[PDB]
Design an enzyme around this catalytic site. Structure first.
Site, PDB file in Angstrom:
ATOM      1  N   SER A 119       2.958  -4.985  -5.432  1.00  0.00           N
ATOM      2  CA  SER A 119       3.370  -3.576  -5.221  1.00  0.00           C
ATOM      3  C   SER A 119       4.472  -3.357  -4.200  1.00  0.00           C
ATOM      4  O   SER A 119       5.578  -3.899  -4.359  1.00  0.00           O
ATOM      5  CB  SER A 119       2.180  -2.680  -4.877  1.00  0.00           C
ATOM      6  OG  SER A 119       1.595  -2.175  -6.057  1.00  0.00           O
ATOM      7  N   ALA A 120       4.201  -2.516  -3.196  1.00  0.00           N
ATOM      8  CA  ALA A 120       5.159  -2.269  -2.135  1.00  0.00           C
ATOM      9  C   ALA A 120       5.626  -3.635  -1.644  1.00  0.00           C
ATOM     10  O   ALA A 120       6.799  -3.842  -1.345  1.00  0.00           O
ATOM     11  CB  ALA A 120       4.496  -1.521  -1.029  1.00  0.00           C
ATOM     12  N   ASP A 130      -0.256  -1.751 -15.998  1.00  0.00           N
ATOM     13  CA  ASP A 130       0.013  -1.479 -14.579  1.00  0.00           C
ATOM     14  C   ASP A 130      -0.083  -0.029 -14.147  1.00  0.00           C
ATOM     15  O   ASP A 130      -0.713   0.280 -13.145  1.00  0.00           O
ATOM     16  CB  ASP A 130       1.412  -1.990 -14.197  1.00  0.00           C
ATOM     17  CG  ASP A 130       1.377  -3.049 -13.120  1.00  0.00           C
ATOM     18  OD1 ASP A 130       0.366  -3.137 -12.397  1.00  0.00           O
ATOM     19  OD2 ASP A 130       2.365  -3.803 -13.003  1.00  0.00           O
ATOM     20  N   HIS A 179      -3.101  -2.018 -12.586  1.00  0.00           N
ATOM     21  CA  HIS A 179      -2.395  -2.331 -11.362  1.00  0.00           C
ATOM     22  C   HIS A 179      -3.333  -3.019 -10.361  1.00  0.00           C
ATOM     23  O   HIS A 179      -4.540  -2.741 -10.309  1.00  0.00           O
ATOM     24  CB  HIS A 179      -1.861  -1.032 -10.756  1.00  0.00           C
ATOM     25  CG  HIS A 179      -0.778  -1.218  -9.733  1.00  0.00           C
ATOM     26  ND1 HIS A 179       0.356  -1.976  -9.962  1.00  0.00           N
ATOM     27  CD2 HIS A 179      -0.611  -0.665  -8.507  1.00  0.00           C
ATOM     28  CE1 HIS A 179       1.174  -1.871  -8.930  1.00  0.00           C
ATOM     29  NE2 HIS A 179       0.611  -1.081  -8.033  1.00  0.00           N
ATOM     30  N   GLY A 231       0.834  -1.187   0.000  1.00  0.00           N
ATOM     31  CA  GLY A 231       0.000   0.000   0.000  1.00  0.00           C
ATOM     32  C   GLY A 231       0.870   1.238   0.000  1.00  0.00           C
ATOM     33  O   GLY A 231       0.844   2.025   0.948  1.00  0.00           O
ATOM     34  N   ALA A 232       1.697   1.369  -1.038  1.00  0.00           N
ATOM     35  CA  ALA A 232       2.611   2.510  -1.191  1.00  0.00           C
ATOM     36  C   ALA A 232       3.515   2.684   0.036  1.00  0.00           C
ATOM     37  O   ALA A 232       4.145   3.717   0.230  1.00  0.00           O
ATOM     38  CB  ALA A 232       1.806   3.797  -1.468  1.00  0.00           C
TER      39      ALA A 232
END
Ligand SMILES: C[C@@H](CCC(=O)NCCS(=O)(=O)O)[C@H]1CC[C@H]2[C@H]3C(C[C@H](O)[C@]12C)[C@@]1(C)CC[C@H](O)C[C@@H]1C[C@H]3O
Ligand SMILES: C[C@@H](CCC(=O)NCCS(=O)(=O)O)[C@H]1CC[C@H]2[C@H]3C(C[C@H](O)[C@]12C)[C@@]1(C)CC[C@H](O)C[C@@H]1C[C@H]3O
Ligand SMILES: *[C@@H]1O[C@H](CO)[C@@H](O)[C@H](O)[C@H]1NC(C)=O
EC number: 3.1.1.13
Length: 532
Positions: free
Chosen positions: A194-195, A320, A435, A107-108
């Site tokens: 992601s992260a 993405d 994404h 989550g970033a």
């Protein structure tokens, strides 16, 4: 089979057991096992002291302190360092020597819960489906996000990367205490999007996880990504400081202060825009990992020796960066409005800042080779989507896999490309795999919640879930507990062969040279241009 009470290093833990099939197939569910003692703000994690007699592991603990929709830090609590285990069970007796697949949410780096978003107990990261079919143990765990997770001053006064340490702590716990649950200690598989994907990478590369990880799976994120490391952390430490009234005139003074500050204020000090901004949003992500003298010692690109004996997979969803370029530019309105050469140039400018106008106009050209006038806007709007996809995920990934391959002692490498387009009826018809679209498929969502899903979806879900699991067991995306509709060939620098993934999974599926030209423009050309 009922594992009943399990004996961890902290004491006995007890979680449910769920009836699945009639022929004795069951699933032991453990939620809320603490792997670490509640962390000291802006301080490394410390082992759990242990408990009295028996811990009732029957519920998801609270996520780490984070902002809600930036209007209030109304989420989680400083206490959150726990993990949830899923052990599939067999009629005859309890599972043994099974493979272990840990999952790192994303989550970033500023958001996230080990449980994953839910709707009436429908937990986005419920590791039941993935465990059952695969016959593998799913482990989800919490880690510090937001400033509290990665706030740094750049030097020993507040190194940062606390969140990663937490992740490392989970893994270490799952290494030590998994045999009692029936898992295979020497077969830990790290996987995450992601992260999380960037985290998977970082963990393998970090010299601290020496002999803990056996397999690794990055998806839509790798350590080499632009957004995956903070180059100037002290610039942001000073910002939070000025907001929380701390002395910005000295790191030691700052640190001492920040550690004393109220986490809620420390969290709510930072607020990502999500509105008309001069620069493309990539520039606002502030709190993410950084290079320190010990965890991530050097630039990730130079640490790949460590993942030499770690089987690895990395991939990207064809579109993405669509999500992102959406906020950066309202291209998606393939209706009324239309993007222009200037709008594209500006984008390129903002995404090239490091190399200035030199790099800007150069890049512009290389991405503007083909054409389509205002009447054929579609190619333009798509190009922007391609620009973001390249710098944000594709190229970094492309260098990650390539880099791994060149450094692999004895470890298979594989790369993919989620092509299955999004159902999102909002996006333009030309929309591909955005994404995070991969998630639901990897988690068996199509099987856990069939209505709202069709055959194709169950096919992709089944395939991916087939691959990941086989991988977790043997290292070969084709071998293990399940059959694969198409064979996944190990990556080669020469062929740069990747497995395209979507409904049709036959023989043509394994394609080669995915935009090798841009891999060339960025790695050789633009890179040579001077830093301004
Ligand atoms: C029961 C549905 C909810 C919407 C509803 O039915 N409204 C329709 C008539 S009306 O509007 O109420 O007037 C279901 C059907 C399929 C569902 C979704 C869903 C939330 C939810 O249960 C949905 C969207 C979710 C993304 C929720 C998050 C989760 O972890 C993934 C999940 C996928 C899918 O099962
Ligand atoms: C996204 C590419 C370009 C950088 C990007 O566009 N940044 C945008 C923000 S900014 O407005 O320019 O500041 C990336 C993707 C992965 C990158 C490469 C790369 C240069 C570069 O940043 C690349 C090629 C480099 C050899 C650059 C040096 C580094 O230490 C090794 C590294 C490998 C890899 O990270
Ligand atoms: C800037 O971009 C334009 C195309 O938009 C190009 O013609 C030019 O050579 C580039 N460099 C300068 C210095 O204008």
């Amino acid at each position: 089979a009922k594992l009943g009470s399990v004996y961890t290093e902290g004491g006995f833990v007890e979680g449910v057991n769920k009836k699945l099939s009639l022929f004795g197939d069951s699933i032991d569910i453990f939620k809320g096992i603490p792997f670490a003692a509640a962390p000291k703000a802006l301080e490394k994690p410390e082992r759990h002291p242990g408990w009295q007699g028996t811990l009732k592991a029957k519920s998801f603990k609270k996520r780490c302190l984070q902002a809600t929709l930036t209007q209030d830090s109304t989420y989680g609590n400083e206490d959150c360092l726990y993990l949830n285990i899923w052990v599939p069970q067999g009629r005859k007796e309890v599972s043994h020597d099974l493979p272990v697949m840990i999952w790192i949410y994303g989550g970033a780096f500023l958001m996230g819960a080990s449980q994953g978003a839910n709707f009436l107990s429908n937990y986005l990261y419920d590791g039941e489906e993935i465990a059952t079919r695969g016959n593998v143990i799913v482990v989800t765990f919490n880690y510090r996000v937001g400033p509290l997770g990665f706030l740094s001053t750049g030097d020993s006064n507040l190194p940062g990367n606390y969140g990663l340490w937490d992740q490392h702590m989970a893994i270490a716990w799952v290494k030590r205490n998994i045999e009692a649950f029936g898992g295979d200690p020497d077969n830990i598989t790290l996987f995450g999007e992601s992260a999380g994907g960037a985290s998977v990478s970082l963990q393998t590369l970090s010299p601290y996880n020496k002999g803990l990880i056996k397999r690794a799976i990055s998806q839509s994120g790798v350590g080499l990504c632009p957004w995956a490391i903070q180059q100037d952390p002290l610039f942001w430490a000073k910002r939070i400081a000025e907001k929380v009234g701390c002395p910005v005139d000295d790191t030691s003074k700052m640190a001492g202060c920040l550690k004393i500050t109220d986490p809620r204020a420390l969290t709510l000090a930072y607020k990502l825009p999500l509105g008309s901004t001069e620069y493309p949003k990539l520039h606002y992500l502030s709190f993410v990992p950084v290079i320190d003298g010990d965890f991530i010692p050097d630039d990730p690109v130079n640490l790949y020796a460590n993942a030499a004996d770690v089987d690895y997979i990395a991939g990207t969803n064809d579109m993405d960066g669509h999500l992102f370029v959406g906020m950066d530019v309202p291209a998606i309105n393939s209706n009324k409005q239309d993007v222009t050469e200037e709008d594209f140039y500006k984008l390129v400018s903002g995404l090239t800042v490091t190399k200035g106008l030199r790099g800007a106009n150069a890049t512009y050209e290389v991405y503007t080779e083909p054409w389509a006038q205002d009447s054929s806007q579609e190619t333009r709007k798509k190009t922007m989507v391609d620009l973001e996809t390249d710098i944000l995920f594709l190229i970094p990934t492309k260098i990650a896999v390539a880099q791994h391959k060149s450094h692999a002692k004895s470890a298979n490498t594989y790369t993919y490309l989620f092509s299955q387009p999004s159902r999102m009826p909002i996006y333009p018809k030309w929309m591909g795999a955005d994404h995070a679209d991969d998630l639901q498929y990897v988690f068996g969502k199509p099987f856990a919640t069939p209505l709202g899903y069709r055959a194709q979806d169950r096919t992709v879900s089944k395939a991916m879930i087939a691959y990941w699991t086989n991988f977790a067991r043997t290292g070969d995306p084709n071998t293990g507990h399940s059959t694969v509709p198409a064979n996944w060939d190990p990556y080669t620098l020469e062929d740069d062969n990747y497995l395209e993934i979507n409904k049709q999974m036959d023989s043509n599926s394994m394609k080669l040279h995915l935009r090798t030209n841009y891999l060339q423009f960025w790695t050789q050309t633009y890179q040579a241009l001077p830093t301004v």
